Design a protein around this ligand. Sequence first.
Ligand SMILES: Nc1nc2c(ncn2[C@@H]2O[C@H](COP(=O)(O)OP(=O)(O)O)[C@@H](O)[C@H]2O)c(=O)[nH]1
Ligand SMILES: *CCS(=O)(=O)NC1CCN(C(=O)CNc2cc(I)c(Cl)cc2OC)CC1
Ligand SMILES: [Mg+2]
Length: 166
Amino acid sequence: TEYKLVVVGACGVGKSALTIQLIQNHFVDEYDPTIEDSYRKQVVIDGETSLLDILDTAGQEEYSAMRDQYMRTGEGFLLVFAINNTKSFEDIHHYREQIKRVKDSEDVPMVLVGNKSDLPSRTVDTKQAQDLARSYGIPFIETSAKTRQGVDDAFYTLVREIRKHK
Ligand SMILES: Nc1nc2c(ncn2[C@@H]2O[C@H](COP(=O)(O)OP(=O)(O)O)[C@@H](O)[C@H]2O)c(=O)[nH]1
Ligand SMILES: *CCS(=O)(=O)NC1CCN(C(=O)CNc2cc(I)c(Cl)cc2OC)CC1
Ligand SMILES: [Mg+2]
């Protein structure tokens, strides 16, 4: 019934912007860290009503112990990098490994997300991202929190993965 999703990735790749676009249908330039721990949205996916619970980690995410808590909480994870930020892409494998270690489980439902597809000066090619995703055996989705391209697709794909195991 309820799916706990956690969006992960480097500082400034668009984690909050993607979540807010999914929940509020608006693009933000900025946001305040909030007392609320998550946003919840009812959606219908493949004919079934589902509740998406997406953690709002802004602020407290800087603490590793808190990230450990978020990872234990999450059922599925969006691995987000920014297509104009090579380092954010190169760090994806570290984040993936950390999640697997914390959850004490190989193969945790994940989707690779390349965000900011609307911006110029792409430094990560689509084929690069697809190759990485293929190596993990997970879907790759290009997104823009600004234009909303791929946003619903990214989160719904993640839900479909989680649904196969819980
Ligand atoms: N043009 C564009 N800007 C974005 C996109 N996603 C996020 N941003 C901007 O990038 C900055 C960092 O986004 P933010 O959500 O705070 O990154 P976070 O640290 O990963 O949560 C903000 O100024 C956003 O407005 C996108 O898809 N396109
Ligand atoms: C904008 C900088 S910050 O200090 O406020 N937040 C940083 C903290 C470190 N960081 C990551 O560890 C990125 N990966 C990641 C994010 C989250 I939220 C969770 Cl739950 C797990 C991971 O890695 C497993 C980037 C932003
Ligand atoms: Mg944020």
